[PDB]
Write a protein that binds this ligand. Structure first.
Ligand SMILES: *[C@@H]1O[C@H](CO)[C@@H](O[C@@H]2O[C@H](CO)[C@@H](O[C@@H]3O[C@H](CO)[C@@H](O)[C@H](O[C@H]4O[C@H](CO)[C@@H](O)[C@H](O)[C@@H]4O[C@H]4O[C@H](CO)[C@@H](O)[C@H](O)[C@@H]4O[C@H]4O[C@H](CO)[C@@H](O)[C@H](O)[C@@H]4O)[C@@H]3O)[C@H](O)[C@H]2NC(C)=O)[C@H](O)[C@H]1NC(C)=O
Ligand SMILES: *Cc1cc2c(nc3c(=O)[nH]c(=O)nc-3n2C[C@H](O)[C@H](O)[C@H](O)COP(=O)(O)OP(=O)(O)OC[C@H]2O[C@@H](n3cnc4c(N)ncnc43)[C@H](O)[C@@H]2O)c(*)c1C
Ligand SMILES: COc1ccc(C[C@H]2c3cc(O)c(OC)cc3CCN2C)cc1O
Ligand SMILES: *[C@@H]1O[C@H](CO)[C@@H](O)[C@H](O)[C@H]1NC(C)=O
Length: 500
């Protein structure tokens, strides 16, 4: 379905002047803006789905009207903030679709009196973090480490980061927000009601409508926090020992502490990158690990004291705090597919050993280990759609990324990742095998919203990944879905089905 004169005239009429139409060209602005926020080259392929038009609204009413104009046609709506969807569900779709890029909605309004902020859904974590440190040295916010990840889909799915052990997810700290429904109705928390305002805070993106802006509570942070990023080159024996003890240390640390691990291997050596964050000074930080985790062999020089801003930039591997404010800094430029696990029981050494052995078989693979507990276990499972709280111990994350040179090995890389996930099945959560909506996994299945045979059973088919992402909260998400989008205008392969 083309993007005809009706759609365009509708946009022109409504003052939404920033938009381009599909172009087979490569030198075109369309293709440029399209590939501008494709954060997973896995989907840069010339055979993937491409929008009939890309619209870049610059205000909440332009956003409202954009949705209104698209509703006059049959197009599927696709919202994009940072475009970091692991499945590229913000710039792809089986059916002809319109791409609503929210990058022009990147304003952060910080209020130092209430210590809250109105973050436009276009604003990325980085641009947000920058705004906060630009305004205060005693304020921060909890969310992912990826500075290019947009708050649009990030906070919509939850938002887990290095401070979540201290403050919970991003969505755990949303006090208000502006959602724009299928009719372009501009709704605040009071207008949308509690069932929906609850849903949008971890229920997923591209499901409830277009978040125009988030109102977050800004969080206290000492003017000096401590972090370390130390890569240990060890053998598999030591690596297992370190990982096996890590899970306990990491999960049982005080909320003022976060210890995350990035593991990979290559035949000979196993490399474990230790990412440390302390909600306080260096001496206390080092004292703690010197006691709890002396095996890391971390030294004084390893611990860096810096502002909270400097720390989230440092942790993200950025050169400077200014780079937090750069939304177009690709952090790898490599295609990838990532599966995640959540643990209820501790993991046997054999699990880390197996993981490390499997890793040593494929250098392009690597695991990310995150501890829960602390503040994550104090927030109710039903406080927000994100269920995994008290009881959840670790977030294990299996990634595999490659170069354009290695595009041929594609299927092989995915094969490895499939083998690793299968290998971990006994050691992780079961019935259901839990997942995280911001780590959306189309392998868990999907829904063909064009197939009425399936659409009639959308809720049960969706159960597979639904209870996996949201567990018991899945029920309330369906009531909330029916209230704000019964027509299922906002959908994607793993969107919450409305009651029909
Ligand atoms: C649809 O949405 C898309 C996405 O948002 C829009 O595309 C964006 O369009 C932006 C402009 O509208 C564009 O910003 C540009 O970014 C470049 C860097 O790539 C930047 O250099 C440009 O900024 C200059 O120009 C603007 C005005 O055009 C000035 O306000 C600004 O101060 C900059 O001018 C200064 O630097 C220039 C060289 O960098 C000098 O030539 C100029 O003289 C001036 O220098 C003075 O100021 C300096 C610093 O203050 C000082 O050192 C010096 O001595 C002088 O005093 C430009 O803004 C984005 O690149 C683009 N974004 C993307 C992702 O493509 C698009 O516009 C929308 N479409 C529609 C229809 O609206
Ligand atoms: C690329 C990348 C992803 C990361 C990174 N680090 C993460 C981390 O530290 N913790 C995590 O929890 N997740 C991490 N991820 C994955 C991201 O969390 C997810 O990819 C988030 O969805 C990020 O959102 P965004 O960058 O905006 O991706 P989009 O593709 O634009 O959107 C995702 C999803 O949400 C819908 N959507 C977008 N915008 C809106 C608005 N404003 N309103 C409602 N819904 C919206 C889209 O349709 C899409 O379906 C580290 C890196 C490098
Ligand atoms: C501190 O905790 C973590 C640290 C790093 C990661 C991996 C990171 C990533 C880093 C890459 O370089 C990359 O290459 C394509 C892909 C990805 C996919 C997931 N993304 C989030 C996950 C974590 O949970
Ligand atoms: C509709 O869904 C069912 C179940 O997946 C499938 O068997 C059938 O082929 C689908 N029909 C269409 C329209 O493709």
């Amino acid at each position: 379905a083309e993007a005809g004169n009706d759609l365009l005239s509708c946009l022109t009429f409504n003052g939404v002047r920033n938009h381009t139409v599909f172009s087979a060209d490569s030198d075109s602005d369309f293709n440029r803006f399209l590939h501008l926020s494709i954060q997973n080259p896995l989907f840069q392929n010339s055979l993937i789905s491409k929008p009939s038009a890309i619209i870049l609204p610059g205000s909440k009413e332009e956003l409202s009207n954009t949705i209104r104009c698209i509703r006059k046609g049959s197009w599927t709506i696709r919202l994009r903030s940072g475009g970091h969807s692991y499945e590229g569900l913000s710039y792809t779709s089986d059916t002809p679709f319109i791409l609503i890029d929210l990058m022009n909605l990147n304003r952060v309004s910080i209020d130092l009196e209430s210590e809250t902020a109105w973050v436009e859904s276009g604003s990325t974590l980085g641009e947000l973090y920058y705004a906060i440190t630009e305004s205060s040295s005693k304020l921060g916010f909890t969310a992912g480490w990826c500075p290019t990840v947009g708050t649009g889909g990030h906070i919509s799915g939850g938002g887990f980061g290095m401070m979540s052990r201290k403050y919970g997810l991003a969505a755990d700290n949303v006090v208000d927000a502006i959602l724009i429904d299928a009719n372009g109705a501009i709704l605040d928390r009071q207008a949308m009601g509690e069932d929906v305002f609850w849903a949008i805070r971890g229920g997923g993106g591209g499901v409830w409508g277009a978040i125009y802006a988030w109102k977050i509570k800004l969080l206290p942070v000492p003017e000096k926090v401590t972090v370390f990023r130390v890569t240990k080159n060890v053998a598999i024996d030591e690596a297992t020992s370190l990982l096996h003890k890590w899970q306990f240390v990491a999960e049982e640390l005080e909320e003022d502490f976060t210890l995350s691990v990035l593991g990979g291997a290559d035949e000979k050596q196993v490399w474990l990158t230790m990412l440390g964050f302390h909600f306080g000074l260096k001496t206390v930080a080092k004292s703690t690990f010197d006691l709890l985790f002396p095996e890391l062999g971390l030294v004084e020089e390893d611990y860096l004291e810096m502002s909270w801003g400097e720390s989230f930039a440092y942790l993200a591997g950025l050169e400077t705090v200014s780079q937090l404010n750069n939304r177009f800094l690709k952090f790898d430029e490599r295609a990838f597919k990532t599966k995640v696990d959540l643990t209820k029981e501790p993991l046997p050494s054999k699990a880390f050993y197996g993981l490390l052995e499997r890793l040593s078989k494929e250098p392009n693979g690597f695991i990310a280990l995150n501890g829960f507990g602390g503040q994550m276990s104090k927030i109710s499972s039903d406080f927000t759609p994100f269920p995994h709280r008290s009881g959840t111990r670790l977030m294990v994350e299996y990634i595999v990324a490659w170069n354009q040179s290695e595009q041929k090995k594609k299927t092989e890389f995915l094969d490895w990742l499939e083998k690793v996930y299968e290998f971990m099945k006994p050691f992780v959560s079961k019935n259901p095998r839990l997942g995280y909506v911001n780590h959306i996994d189309l392998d868990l299945g999907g829904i063909d919203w064009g197939n009425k045979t399936v659409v009639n059973n959308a809720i049960e088919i969706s159960r597979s990944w639904g209870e996996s992402y949201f567990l018991s909260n899945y029920e309330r998400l369906i009531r909330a879905k029916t209230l704000i989008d019964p027509n299922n205008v906002f959908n994607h392969p793993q969107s919450i089905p409305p009651m029909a």
